[PDB]
Amino acid sequence: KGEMNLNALFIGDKAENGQLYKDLLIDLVDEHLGWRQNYMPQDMPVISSQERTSKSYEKTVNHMKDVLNEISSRMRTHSVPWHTAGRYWGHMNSETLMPSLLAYNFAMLWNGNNVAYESSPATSQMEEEVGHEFAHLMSYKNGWGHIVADGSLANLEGLWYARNIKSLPFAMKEVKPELVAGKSDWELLNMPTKEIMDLLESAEDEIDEIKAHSARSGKHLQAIGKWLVPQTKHYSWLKAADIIGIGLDQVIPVPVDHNYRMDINELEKIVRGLAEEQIPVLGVVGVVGSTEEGAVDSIDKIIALRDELMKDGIYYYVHVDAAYGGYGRAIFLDEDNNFIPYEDLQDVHEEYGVFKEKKEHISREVYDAYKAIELAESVTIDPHKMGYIPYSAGGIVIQDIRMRDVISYFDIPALLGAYILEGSKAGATAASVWAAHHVLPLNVAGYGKLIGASIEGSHHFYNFLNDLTFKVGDKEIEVHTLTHPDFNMVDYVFKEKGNDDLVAMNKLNHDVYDYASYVKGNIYNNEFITSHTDFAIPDYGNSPLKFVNSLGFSDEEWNRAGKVTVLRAAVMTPYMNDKEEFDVYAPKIQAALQEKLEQIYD
Amino acid sequence: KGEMNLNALFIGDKAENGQLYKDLLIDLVDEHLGWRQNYMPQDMPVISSQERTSKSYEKTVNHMKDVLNEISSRMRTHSVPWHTAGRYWGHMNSETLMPSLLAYNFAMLWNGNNVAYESSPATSQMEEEVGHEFAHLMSYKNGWGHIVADGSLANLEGLWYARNIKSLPFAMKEVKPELVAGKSDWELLNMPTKEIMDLLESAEDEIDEIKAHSARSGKHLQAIGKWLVPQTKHYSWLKAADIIGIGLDQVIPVPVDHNYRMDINELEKIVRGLAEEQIPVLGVVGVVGSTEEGAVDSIDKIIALRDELMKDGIYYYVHVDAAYGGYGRAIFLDEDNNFIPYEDLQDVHEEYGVFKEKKEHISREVYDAYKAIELAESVTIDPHKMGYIPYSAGGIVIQDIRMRDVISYFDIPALLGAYILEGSKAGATAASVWAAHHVLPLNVAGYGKLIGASIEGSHHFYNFLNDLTFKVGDKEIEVHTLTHPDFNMVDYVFKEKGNDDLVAMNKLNHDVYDYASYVKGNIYNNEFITSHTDFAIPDYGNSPLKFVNSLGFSDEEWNRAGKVTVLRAAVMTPYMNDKEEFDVYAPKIQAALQEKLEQIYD
Ligand SMILES: CN[C@H](C)Cc1ccc(O)cc1
Numbered sequence A, B: 001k002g003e004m005n006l007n008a009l010f011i012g013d014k015a016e017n018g019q020l021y022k023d024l025l026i027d028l029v030d031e032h033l034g035w036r037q038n039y040m041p042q043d044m045p046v047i048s049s050q051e052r053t054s055k056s057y058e059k060t061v062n063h064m065k066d067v068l069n070e071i072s073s074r075m076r077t078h079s080v081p082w083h084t085a086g087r088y089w090g091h092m093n094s095e096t097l098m099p100s101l102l103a104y105n106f107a108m109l110w111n112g113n114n115v116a117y118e119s120s121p122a123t124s125q126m127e128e129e130v131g132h133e134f135a136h137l138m139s140y141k142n143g144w145g146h147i148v149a150d151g152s153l154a155n156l157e158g159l160w161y162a163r164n165i166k167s168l169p170f171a172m173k174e175v176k177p178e179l180v181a182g183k184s185d186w187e188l189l190n191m192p193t194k195e196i197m198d199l200l201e202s203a204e205d206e207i208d209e210i211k212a213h214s215a216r217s218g219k220h221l222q223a224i225g226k227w228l229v230p231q232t233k234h235y236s237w238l239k240a241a242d243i244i245g246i247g248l249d250q251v252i253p254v255p256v257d258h259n260y261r262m263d264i265n266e267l268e269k270i271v272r273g274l275a276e277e278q279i280p281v282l283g284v285v286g287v288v289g290s291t292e293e294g295a296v297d298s299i300d301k302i303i304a305l306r307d308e309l310m311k312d313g314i315y316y317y318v319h320v321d322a323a324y325g326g327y328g329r330a331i332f333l334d335e336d337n338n339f340i341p342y343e344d345l346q347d348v349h350e351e352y353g354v355f356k357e358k359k360e361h362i363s364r365e366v367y368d369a370y371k372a373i374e375l376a377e378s379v380t381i382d383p384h385k386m387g388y389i390p391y392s393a394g395g396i397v398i399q400d401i402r403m404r405d406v407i408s409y410f411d412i413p414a415l416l417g418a419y420i421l422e423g424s425k426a427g428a429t430a431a432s433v434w435a436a437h438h439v440l441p442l443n444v445a446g447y448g449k450l451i452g453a454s455i456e457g458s459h460h461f462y463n464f465l466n467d468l469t470f471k472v473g474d475k476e477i478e479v480h481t482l483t484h485p486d487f488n489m490v491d492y493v494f495k496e497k498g499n500d501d502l503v504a505m506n507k508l509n510h511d512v513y514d515y516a517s518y519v520k521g522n523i524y525n526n527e528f529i530t531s532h533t534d535f536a537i538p539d540y541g542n543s544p545l546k547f548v549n550s551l552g553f554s555d556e557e558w559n560r561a562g563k564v565t566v567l568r569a570a571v572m573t574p575y576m577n578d579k580e581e582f583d584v585y586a587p588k589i590q591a592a593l594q595e596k597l598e599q600i601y602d
């Protein structure tokens, strides 16, 4: 369709499209009301005219207005103003896509339940297509997916898959050992996911019994091996281990580098070491877009290592924690769904308006990481993160649709609840996601353009912060960026030129955070808002040491402070990719930071 | 406030309040838009006037309209017309509360994330109050709760609690054995939940280490005992066992009676037997409002048995699966939150309009079951079932707020995600639930009146079906109700007077189901819609045998057919409590069933 205008797909930083939203919103409500009325048009309304003007009705409507006025007062006092175009530089939140908002309220009037096709065929059919759209977003050939309440639960479902997968070889030896005849025991704990899947689908009349002897029964949960995750992982991963049965003790942190990506050398050291101890690797977790720094694990290097390890008989499951960055992969896909060759990226992105100044914006490392996702077994992807779809809407994609038989209980599921971890599920959530995917195709013609704006906006912010120097009363405060962003997240810290006190810097940034958040003051009057996170040795190691030293801090300070406090901005506003529009908000960020620093002294 | 009018709280069976909904809906949107604009009123709109009338904008808005028109076409073709006043007699679906609908779309414009207070203080504060409102709904003295994506996941969180609770005594023996000095091993596996909780909160500096040696680590998951559930349980319970680590093999079905409630005799036989084998009881699941029959387990009898078993040193955790019936408990609570004495119920219910003909509507058995919930450790309750709150919104209540320390990771949580099973969570869901609880108090002055209408509507349907006899061309088809409803669910079957063929009846009811569902025809033209379920010996035993014989079927037929097919109606319409309004739809149900039977022959 040539090239769509992202500015028509948001209510707006200043409600510029408020009328458009209301008109479409009310049109949709009207179509629903009309649908209600003409189901059984012969039925007369149960609520009479006299009822609707009676006093009982009025006092109830007034009580309802009272409640909504209190809800409105509370929302309008404390909610976060991240709809702003260039003043909110923090958490993974901006506006959400108007078509999703519209479709959600529309779908909610029907209130269909997607756990069961009978309850809502249309939103049920819609969720199946969303699953296939997740798969093609991941270049899965014959893959699948479904909407999940959120990323954490999708991650848990990742472990549910992996845990059950590693247990299936042992369970084949117990029910139909012919499938795994002549296989060692350690060979069974290192079968590639596909061999396990080909074997299970081979034993049609025995699938039920093999699954009955699987990790579903409760047996062999420590036998199935260690779960490896980046040391900077999201706590949902701990929670996932805990809940799924392998437990916290079967979770091994793989160290990260100075770019805060899984050190593939130490990943190799850990996997090979465990293999010498005959300890199986349940799976490895690669994060494409880490929570605290927006880093992209080299997924290619992770899957190539699995390829170089299978010669030594070592196979690990790979699940990609793309809760945040999953939708980003649409920037690499052309309208035929082919991964754009890297050398053609800057051209295609210019052709499609994905990026508006033609330079390199995406590493080939980050590029390569995203392509390799198609080889992982499963992916967590949050529509309510970089899908710009409203909470609550997470996702999971599986490389092979058959894999869902490892988890099923008893093509379009008649009871999708039998193929997923959770239960009841809003068909409105599926309509909300389907609407976004069908207004914005999951490639450069749609989401690519929105992801590109995110990244470009993050890049202008990186170049603004670099060199940002403020003069705060004899003191000169200087801004330093953490690493060049692998995605759209820009971490940064403020430091006094001279102060070699790292706990004093951490207290400086903890003070700018306080003045740039709900802590100090009214959020509705905050001229600049950000988030903050702590890099502590227990979880980050000395991964920040190169950075702490770049700033002039000693290895002793680093150990004395034991952590570094950094401000993060997951730059999700779509309005800042235009240099000129960013230039409007640059002086308003420096000015807001100037009094926030001046306030931290005096 | 005297007595509120349920008819103002729904868009309506025929959109009678459509205008009211749109006006409030648009008022709310306008307040949000105004809030956006006056965050930083000095900022000029980023989207220019020229942009909003440009051609790029128009084609994108048109593409968006195209997508919504396809969403609308699909929704209006296949969605279920359960908004109708008295024609939908099936699944747990009617209208949802307008204030919830309104609050949800309002909250969604802010799109706050409740996993973290910073992301949305107002909806975060709202969810805390919802938790306390869940607790007081359960008469928990100093209890707690939170919204859960759905019932299944709340059930899973129930097992997460129980699994971790039974493991804590063993873990105290490993980290601070003083707490459990002189305690046998089997005594440790039978400590009452409160003793475990008092001991954990006693060891302040060791809480972290005890939890590190708990079931969170992965150890002792088969040591902690068997999970007992009604044989007619929801598959989420199987799924819960599977996922949580104890596995399918640690799940013991307790037989049910002819009223399809947990046979407390056989519950006692199972628990005492396991105790003679020194096998601990992880917990028992009591269902208040079963999925397929709306039966209410005698929770009082379950907790009194626990009281009579602790003398023999046998303690079991009790979790109440009230996904469906949980909100029903509001019918028993007066405006000071005291459980209404049973002998005063029919008076108070008449006083408050909870019931409109003054007779017994609620057994003292069902009454007693509901009161006993206050002694259970935790409860699953679905706002999106009998809360009339839109999907997706489940719930969990815990008897003792401290219990959440058994599950926490690292008063108003600053990171509610550290106190719950799931992760990201729509603040809009909390606003939606808070709005309902604050328009309708969780007692006879609010939800009681809505639950009462449900039950009364179900009672008129029971008396209609009883005696419903149709003449279908020389054949005379007769309707038989399954059991008197413990709540608002009415099961029933159609039988040929004469046919002693039970598989032939099951095929008759499977044919009425086909004509009364999306199977045969357009759902939008179906004059009567219902659900259907199969009572199969593997899961129901001979619990339906008394019923199968009441209808004239042999114990041989029952074993020959191996199941009975029953139609279920979870009567959730609020419009049918008025005998006169039910009388309008009685002839339209018989007439719709008359041609649906006539169509099944010929
Ligand atoms: C069969 N009843 C299940 C347990 C929950 C559910 C499913 C579909 C619905 O439309 C409504 C409720």
Ligand SMILES: CN[C@H](C)Cc1ccc(O)cc1
Pocket (backbone or CB within 6 Å): A091, A092, A093, A234, A291, B113, B115, B116, B119, B424
């Ligand atoms: C810290 N980021 C977590 C992992 C997810 C999240 C939390 C709050 C938000 O407002 C948005 C996203």
